[PDB]
From a paper:
Insects, instead, rely on a distinct family of sweet gustatory receptors, which are tetrameric ligand-gated cation channels. An extreme example of sugar specialization occurs in a conserved subfamily of gustatory receptors founded by Drosophila melanogaster Gr43a (DmGr43a), whose members are selectively activated only by the monosaccharide d-fructose, providing a unique opportunity to investigate how specificity for a single sugar is achieved. Here we investigate the structural basis of sugar discrimination by Gr9 (BmGr9), the silk moth B. mori orthologue of DmGr43a. Our results thus indicate that receptor tuning in BmGr9 arises from two distinct but complementary mechanisms: the stereoelectronic characteristics of the ligand-binding pocket; and the engagement of an allosteric process required to activate the channel.
To gain insight into the mechanism of receptor activation, we also determined the structure of BmGr9 in the absence of ligand. We resolved a map of similar quality as the fructose-bound BmGr9 but with the extracellular hydrophobic gate closed, consistent with the absence of any density in the ligand-binding pocket. In the unbound structure, Phe444 side chains from each subunit face the centre of the ion-conducting pore, erecting a hydrophobic barrier that constricts the pore diameter and prevents ion passage, similar to the gate observed in olfactory receptors. In the closed state, Gln443 hydrogen bonds with Gln445 from a neighbouring subunit. In the absence of a ligand, the vestibule connecting the pocket to the extracellular surface is approximately 8 Å wide, large enough for sugar molecules to access the bottom of the pocket freely. In the closed state, Tyr332 and Phe333 are exposed to the membrane interior through a gap between the S7b and S2 helices, where additional columnar lipid or detergent density is observed in the structure of unbound BmGr9. Nearby, Arg90 in S2 reaches across the gap between subunits to interact with carboxy-terminal carbonyls of S5 in the absence of ligand.
Numbering used by the authors:
A (entry chain B), B (entry chain C), C (entry chain D), D (entry chain A): 14 to 229, 271 to 275, 281 to 445
């Protein structure tokens, strides 16, 4: 039993296996999957991302060296630089996601053993219904993004079909759109790893509330098998394990998350800018305007997908703080349970469960307020000049 | 005795009952009101807000589809978009306030039972004089806003009366102004709920100071019935209850408060902008200038109404920290009271009483400095171009 | 012995007594001064500030109603509004400083009794040499500002002497410059109150370090009369007293400090703007350029005078944290001194000594980085247009 | 044995000895160096920096008083002011670095005695391989900067060689480039001092993890000689020593670091601005464009060199918090080790190991996000006008 991963977390692991973001061998256990590092899939991922990056660079050069008037996607020198920056940052995100995948998956197994131990101590992580709901949500997001990407590709190819270069744009941007798909699959993978960890933290909070209830294999499906004195110690150990796992996830996904946030800034500055520039000046294009609106919505959705599970984890930490306070008010004053609650309070004060990619920022809802605050500041400056 | 609400908090609950923001059945108890969820008032609120939103959308379309020169309120394409955004955000705020009211009122009763228990343990929340003062302040704010709304409506109707469409503007903006009234009634409701909770927290701090005084049904109107050892434990339990209630209030009002803050940003950017544009270019209109000044003052007052009770609650938390420190310096060093104060200090360090709508920001005076700091930055950029 | 104030804190109290910012009766005790609230000086302060504000408003109207070309200080419509805002904010600062002085002085005596108790327990606050140095620094700052104000008045009067209105400018701006003097005297008063409190906190830290040294009326001029067990408790009580006094000072000076910070923002935005506008376009005036440079330096010095004592107090708090950590590493592990250090650590964690005017901001060096960061942002925007 | 410094920290001390930033006498001990303050080197440093500053001021005047068209480096009035500000801030940084060096080196010895004690208690700080790696990295950075400086000097001299003033630019900028070298050597010196301290902190964390492992001269190369009860107390004392040393380093380097951060802001605003201005308008110069790109990269590298060791120290503090939490979950509950861990937790909560130059800001990765956030805001404003 090396890893024994399952649920919606293992669904995105199989999906990202083909994208190169999870080079694992999936052994079905009729309930979950036992995943191990495979060198064949690692080599496949490396060669796939290298080929895609080479093709993307070649297409960027071919769309830059053609000129300005002849190119369809790029129509100005400023548009050439910003589109080149977009392509380069997307390629960098994909390269960080795929090249760093085998190390990330090794870390994943390394903390998944402890996650398996914690789940055994608590009992399950999700019900079947909510696991199916999460899988359906992941599939809906992935299919929506894939449909938008295909529509954008088809629109930009048909627009170039009037000139005659209907295949040149395809050759220049197939790798770019594959890299887009890889980047969003990586975003979904991080989001669902964080969501599974947050579910485990929620179960830990439920166990604390249960040992508060004093009904009387710590948790069963409620009641409490062990006395509250040792249950609190076991829960403190499990919370330290969860903190270690959250730190491991943040370390594994820090660089991709930072580059994704930078890409989100760039896109939320650029796509609304050209969307507005195509409104006030002259629309003349329903499909382009609809695509730009959908791309703005998709960038906002990607930022939300990145941020929201981290906010939920922080909220679960606040909830366990509240539960611990309610515990400390109760319980015999001089008893041994009170000192266990004191130790748990010291643990809660010393370390908290949060996501800080590379330490530059804290993934939470206040971060997206700063992002949208900066985006509007640049947009107000940029738009008012034209 | 389901809820037994009373005072200035129950005054805004009866006022917001007709606006649809509090679908409760008010049973007078000759001292307070026993409020329960009523399905008839819930349906009335839902149909009222739906009708108002439909009428507002129809009026927005009719004032947009008429043109630019013919419309009185909107005189440019840029003015059409910003006024449409204003109407849409006000309608969204009203819809969130009214559609989410029955859940908010259920939460209100759910923590009001604990508030009743806490008030019974402490004794009262306000005197009659200060309750009358708070009711008078609420009535003054509501009447000032209603007078300003009526004056704005009358001015914009009489201005359109020259052209001949004296009734078209009325039909297009009656729903909008009703939604304005609903939004400010919701703001007042949140503010006075927070004020009542802050009064309870202030009474808790007074009880801590009394158990410090060591004079010797915890609090009476001073002295202390129970010994300070158990009084501190009961006060710790009551503070945890107050923290839970504050969290419930923040959860109930988070989305409306966030949208209200966004509307405050938009209005403090737009209304001063047009006020200045009507000053430097040409005034020619005393009534319009006075109305714009009054609207800027009203937006600032609304932001203050939102923020200020939260700042007072935070100040009460700081005060209880200071009282606890003064307690810990006193009291026998090795006694059981010292350990109770240790537990209370751990509670104070672990959790604090604050308002964080949706977790995006903390409602406090520093927040309004950031708001006014951003408002001036946009205004300096926007004004200097013209 | 009502108050018994002395030193550089009582030097600015006698200076601000005539400005109306300290309506106290100074009874010399041959070592210090026993100050009490006097109704005669309160009435004198009220009538003086009312007369000065009335004269300032009259002069502002007379310099606005004259026109644009004829007025010397104001040469444009934009210059009329910004100079009017400057005069109004200075008058508001002076009115808040003088009208709120009697309450501020009552609070001053109320915490000065506890300061006297603390000084008796510790022993002195400053040596004679450093008290003379602080008095000399205060006198140097006051004389520098007075010389700059007199030079500015003389320059603006002589410039208007060419036209013939050599006395109209004097009549219109005498009250304004008196209000300037009052505002800076208030700034100096707050700064030196904070400096005296910081000196007391530094002596408290020295006493903690001494009880760490374990040499063996707590502090003498070193050694320790009482055993370290009770010395730490007495020091904890004294630190709570110092925290209460700092909170009282912040409450007394919050509104004046907030308005002073707003004035500092406005002046650091406006004076450099016109200084640059008089450089790139055409200088033609050495005296005006020198005066503008000196006024920029004076505004920076005023901001530093406001911020710096608060930063020193925060640094003293950090120092006492470090001293407490060093104490906790030492001392017998299971002894009673260890538990006293535990209580002191809980005090240090629960509350800290800081200045937060009205709760909107924290007076510290990071605040002035935000101020200068915002000032340059507006200056970069404003200057680049011309 | 006065100091006994060695490793990569003593490599930059010998390099900065000639630049005047470390006036020490290096006595080889066949393993390390025993460094003492030398008055001869102090006088040499003072006269060297004074001569360089005088020459820099003379060259700035000669390049300003020549005019605009004739000067090669400066081609406009705006370019004259910004280049003068660059030269002045670099000269101020060099003067603060060299004039304050003897005090900084005295502080260095004062905490290096305690560092020697801590290293004796723990055992070593770096292996030979990693010390050689750090020396190689320092040499690579220094040689890269020296090559860039020499190339910039040669390019600007050859550009002026067409006119005929091939030696005037050399005479005017030799002192400026020497000051550049001094400033970056000071940056490297601070960075490597911080890196050595961070290595010691990492060894302290390793010792805590070892006393967690419970294998059983505290640390040996693993196992633990002393029982965990007293090992934790000795580690707490060592952590307080490390905190004192970090505070001493921050105090010594605060002003140079603040001026370096200001210079980084100025350069990251100015060099990209002219780099873009030389791209959109007309390039016509490959060497100038390459030099501007390299200078932008060098400014970013200098900011990273300043910030990164501080971020690593903060990360080590977070790691010791996590290790302490894991310790507190383990260990007998009522034993004496638990109370030692309680004291260590109080130490960790009261004080943390961080770098705050002058208290204005905290050196960490979030700081460089604010720096780059402000840099782009000014660049977006400035670039869009042209």
């Amino acid at each position: 039993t090396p890893c024994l991963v399952g649920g919606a977390h293992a669904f995105i692991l199989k999906i990202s296996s083909f994208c190169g973001l999870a080079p694992l061998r999936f052994e079905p256990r009729s309930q979950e999957y036992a995943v191990t590092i495979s060198k064949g899939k690692c080599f496949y991922s490396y060669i796939l991302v290298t080929f895609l990056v080479i093709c993307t660079i070649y297409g960027l050069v071919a769309e830059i060296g053609v000129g300005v008037e002849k190119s369809v996607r790029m129509s100005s020198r400023m548009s050439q630089v910003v589109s080149a920056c977009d392509i380069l940052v997307v390629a960098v995100t994909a390269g960080v996601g795929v090249y760093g995948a085998p190390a990330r998956m090794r870390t994943m197994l390394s903390y998944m053993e402890n996650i398996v131990a914690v789940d055994r101590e608590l009992g399950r992580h999700h019900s079947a219904a909510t696991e199916r709901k999460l899988c359906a949500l992941l599939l809906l997001i992935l299919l929506s993004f894939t449909i938008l990407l295909v529509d954008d590709f088809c629109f930009y190819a048909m627009q170039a079909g009037k000139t005659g270069r209907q295949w040149e744009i395809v050759t220049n941007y197939a790798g770019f759109y594959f890299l887009w798909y890889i980047v969003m699959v990586l975003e979904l993978q991080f989001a669902f790893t964080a969501l599974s960890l947050r579910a485990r933290l929620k179960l830990f909070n439920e166990a604390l509330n249960v040992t508060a209830s004093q009904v009387c294999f710590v948790m069963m499906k409620p009641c409490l098998q062990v006395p509250p004195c040792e249950a609190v110690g076991r829960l403190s150990r499990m919370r330290c394990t969860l903190c270690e796992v959250t730190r491991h996830i943040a370390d594994g996904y820090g660089l991709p998350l930072v580059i994704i946030l930078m890409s989100t800034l760039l896109h939320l500055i650029v796509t609304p800018y050209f969307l507005i520039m195509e409104i006030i000046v002259s629309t003349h294009r329903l499909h382009f305007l609809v695509l730009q609106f959908l791309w703005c919505t998709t960038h906002l959705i990607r930022m939300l997908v990145v941020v929201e599970p981290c906010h939920y984890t922080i909220r679960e930490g606040k909830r366990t703080e509240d539960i611990l306070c309610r515990l400390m008010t109760l319980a015999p004053h001089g008893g041994v349970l009170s000192s266990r609650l004191e130790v748990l309070s010291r643990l809660l004060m010393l370390q908290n469960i949060s996501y800080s990619p590379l330490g530059m920022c804290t993934l939470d809802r206040p971060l997206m307020v700063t992002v949208l605050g900066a985006v509007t500041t640049y947009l107000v400056i940029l738009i008012q000049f034209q």
